[PDB]
Amino acid sequence: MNTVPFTSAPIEVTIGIDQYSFNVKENQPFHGIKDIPIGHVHVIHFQHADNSSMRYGYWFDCRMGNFYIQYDPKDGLYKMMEERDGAKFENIVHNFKERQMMVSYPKIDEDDTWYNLTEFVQMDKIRKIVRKDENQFSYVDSSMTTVQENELSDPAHSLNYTVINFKSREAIRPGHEMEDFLDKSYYLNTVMLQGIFKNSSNYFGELQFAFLNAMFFGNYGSSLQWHAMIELICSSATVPKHMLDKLDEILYYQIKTLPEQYSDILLNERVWNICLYSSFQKNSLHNTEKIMENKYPELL
């Protein structure tokens, strides 16, 4: 069980830790989050009470270092930082725990929700999509644009998702125009899985990371990436049976977790209708189709 201490909470803020969130008052004696499960990535996220615009946050793995949050009154945000002095850190965390100034990561024993949303998500892959190599944690916010969005502007602050474009030379073999456009199996299996991702695990990792950025920060480019990666699988006639079974599970937990009130902006009608009702895989996503029909029948 790991801990992310906070130096202080000088400004009133809603703090998210994975799928949980807590209101903190201006100068409330809040000193951080304890009992964070080892074995998963996590995201700690912020929305200021005075600016319900700019959701921002930090992807991290407590196995990779000792991390804390400290408010920067110049840049006006809660910043993640690494403490290199292990004994200073243990001594800080022990004091704050003794004085019970920390919220406990509120995991229910039965509850596999966070595992099910992050199954294939790896910190090493996050750090390649979000490039800032001097830190072991990754900053994301609502406004960060994707490499693909920038092509259609600051590259240092971009989300480097794998570019997927159904009307690109990458996606379409010369003399297989109709075949490759109507059945994307070539693009999915040779170009993306064998060629770029290397395996279905890294592909699912990026898909799950894109969803989480869309849900937790309302990052529009992440939403586009999540939908593109779903549509590429659904639009392929030939997909390994283990990938379809796993995609059904991944999507089920994503749809289960989505705030009911955000379905209008986070779910693309065309993609979901195509994927569940027209696509090659229309009959392969039983769990996902049942939860979508029972939870968002309007969208369909």
Partner: protein
């Protein structure tokens, strides 16, 4: 984006462009089988690819053999169209390649965009105009070469004959669209109007009769009359 009544003069500027119409690519007769089921028999088709400025028509004849053993033919027809247009562009010298291709039907946009990925600078555009290019097979000499083809063939025409010696492209295109609209609305009446006077013939190297400027005004008037009548009929107004 889309081509409409607002940006009409763009057709007659000095940027090479082509209209593509796929409406006569896949043509069938529907018939009863011996068992009393229904079946189609494909007949020869054509891609209608037209430079509206020059009148140059690239009539790609689609022989029924291209459908043999193929499924989902109405879908294939769009892709075969896009493949043939793409092959035509690649066959043209660079300075003759179009800067824009306008498809008469929106279902051609994705097939043509995908076949033309090698030509990122050629704009693929839909149109809001309801162009009567489906009536191309009502031009006797175009119908004859399609129906006699025993193999895939490209035949080059000037759909304006020698009109550009006397009128602008704008006017030549308006004449062409009025003739085709008439042929589309009432073929028999339109063909009667065009050939009623046997003294006016079609030159061997032409599609339409050799009308004087005065005789085109009369013809053009008779085609507008034909079109308004049929409209009153269709709609009881």
């Amino acid at each position: 984006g889309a081509m409409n009544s607002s940006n009409y003069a763009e057709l007659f500027n000095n940027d090479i462009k082509l209209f593509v119409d796929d409406t006569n690519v896949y043509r069938v007769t529907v018939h009863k089988t011996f068992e009393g089921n229904v079946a189609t028999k494909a007949i020869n088709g054509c891609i209608f690819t037209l430079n509206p400025k020059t009148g140059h028509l690239f009539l790609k004849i689609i022989h029924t053999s291209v459908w043999a053993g193929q499924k989902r033919l109405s879908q294939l027809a769009k892709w075969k169209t896009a493949e043939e247009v793409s092959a035509l562009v690649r066959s043209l010298p660079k300075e003759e390649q179009p800067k824009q291709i306008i498809v008469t039907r929106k279902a051609m946009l994705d097939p043509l965009e995908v076949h033309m990925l090698d030509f990122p600078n050629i704009a693929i555009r839909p149109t809001e105009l309801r162009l009567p290019f489906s009536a191309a097979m009502s031009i006797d000499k175009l119908s004859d070469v399609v129906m006699k083809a025993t193999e895939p063939q490209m035949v080059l025409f000037n759909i304006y004959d020698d009109w550009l010696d006397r009128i602008s492209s704008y006017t030549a295109f308006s004449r062409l669209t009025l003739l085709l609209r008439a042929l589309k609305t009432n073929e028999e009446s339109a063909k009667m109007i065009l050939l009623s006077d046997p003294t006016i013939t079609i030159k061997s190297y032409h599609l339409w009769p050799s009308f004087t400027d005065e005789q085109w005004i009369t013809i053009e008037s008779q085609m507008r009359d034909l079109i308004l009548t049929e409209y009153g009929r269709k709609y009881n107004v």
